[model samples]
Target: KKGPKVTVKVYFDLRIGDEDVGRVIFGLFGKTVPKTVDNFVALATGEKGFGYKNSKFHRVIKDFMIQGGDFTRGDGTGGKSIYGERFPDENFKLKHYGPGWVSMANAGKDTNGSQFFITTVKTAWLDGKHVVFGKVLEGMEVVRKVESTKTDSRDKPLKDVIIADCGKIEVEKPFAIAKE
Candidate 1:
């Protein structure tokens, strides 16, 4: 069964000390990937993002991406990796990956949950594979600053980074909730 049509507004809280680098990402995904978008909304609207105030940026890749969302660890590896959530490839359409595109950081398809990644460079190869739900519309400068921090080969950020908060913007016409 198809799900509701909805538009979720994801704000990026760049944990960097710099204000310019912190950004807010606004996106409408159901228009592209309905199932995935619904899944994301259900989580966001619940007790997940807000419930954890000090979540860490556990997975950091130098010159590539910085990922975190596993609420269990405050680190990146201690939660249930949501399985079988992968929709058919036809579920995605937005391709232009930019500074703020919020893509799913996963080991493979159907393995996403609390893990997410932000792009520091133009990652085109990720266009059709990982789910791109939202993008950073502001504070990219903060992202750059965070990415500049020291790290090891494991893509772990040298310093402690936290997601200060997470929120959503309600839309009158939710894209995914529309009756087909």
Candidate 2:
């Protein structure tokens, strides 16, 4: 009823500590991946009492993806879903076609958690490997900014990249906004 897709925005900041990065808007494929979208939205809006705010993007791979949503540990090691610790993949209908593609970061099949990544290139090889659920509706420049941040031996950004704020945006159904 609200529409096939839902919009959310994430305001970013430094990890270990630096100035704020900027905001990135994402449009969730709610229709195709309802469970995944709902989990993300609820966590983002804090409808669940606890959520993604203050979490850190512990891993940042240049030209690959930026992973985060690990509020439990602020590192690659921990994150729990709105439902629980992990959730099953809704489907593989969505594809990892190019830059800005958002998908679930799972340990393996049926292992989805809060962790996710945004592709920075045409990573077609990941098309069926991850549960693609959304895309960057705005702020590819911001994502690119995160991508370009200097990293350590383990791909950790020298300055921690944190999700300062994240939540749903009350907007009209059409949700018209963006560019490829």
Candidate 3:
């Protein structure tokens, strides 16, 4: 069963920093996590007037994940949910069972904002803690390339990890939610 599930694409410029690293397509579990998905969709489309365009994936850890959406601070400390300053973790129905799991990056329980991460490897310990809202449907290797960029002591990439462009991907057919 499904209800208006969605997909989006974020063009990345990492490693080489100034060049395109290709696109990462994410399939959001819209019906499963409506609030979270809507928040992401709004930000991606810039329908709310501000968005992921020109945003930087300020944090990256190899074998862990590449995170972004701190469009306000560009550091991990800033971002706003289209809902408000923060929104509750809609649910934990999805799990960080393997790579490409796109999950919320909150500071604590229910503190979800615009920040999100795509897993590069199984992050079993993250399950039940962060809200898993979606998964990468394509270009996982580009995410891996973002993960592989050189970083400093603070985990900030030495080369900029930019989201050059972003927007929703119109589905040709209605999305059928995949049973996990």
Candidate 4:
């Protein structure tokens, strides 16, 4: 039995230092991953009093993905959810097959929190390992630019690529027609 349908879109305005990279708008799979989406939206909107603002893209793997959202220590080590604690992974049945797919970054099973990554290439191997809460609806070229940025030995961007600002924006999804 299917439940009620709930759809929402959240936008994140990305920046690299002083330059405005672009906006990454994504659709929230709230019905599939409610807790994860709620956490992300809360963190992005700073409803938790601290959000993705001024957080650097600490890890950038070329042609793979760019990881960030560590608003505390600026590295991949520190991150927290709206609850100030780690939460169980949503583990939705979404595939990591295309660029612009956003997924939560975790150390292991049931370790998801505030960190996330935006895929710039096909990453099917990541399927079932992370929660695919959203997909980038715009500004993919900007994501490509971030992928091409130079990084250090640790995959940290030599010049910081900051998420200057981010917030949730409502979006209306077009109705889909089903064929019998």
* Best candidate, lDDT: 3
Q: TM per model?
A: 0.71, 0.87, 0.89, 0.89
Report the Cα lDDT for candidate 1: 0.59
Segments of candidate 4 deviating more than 4 angstroms = 1-6, 172-180
What lDDT does the true structure give each of the candidates? 0.59, 0.77, 0.81, 0.79
lDDT of 1 by residue, 122-159 (tens): 67788777777666555676777777777757667766
Better of 1 and 4 by TM-score: 4
Q: TM-score of model 2 relative to the true fold?
A: 0.87
lDDT of 2 by residue, 34-148 (tens): 8998888787877788878877777888879988888898777788889899988889876786688888888888988898988888788887878987888777888888888
How do these models rank on lDDT, best leading?
3, 4, 2, 1
Model 1 stretches astray by more than 4 angstroms: 1-6, 16-23, 41-52, 80-90, 172-180
Model 3 poorest ten-residue lDDT run: 7-16
Instruction: Estimate the TM-score for candidate 4.
Output: 0.89
* Residue 150 in candidate 4, Cα distance off native in Å: 0.9
lDDT of 3 at 24: 80
Give residue 110's lDDT in candidate 4 (0 to 100): 88
lDDT of 4 by residue, 121-150 (tens): 878888888988777767888888888888
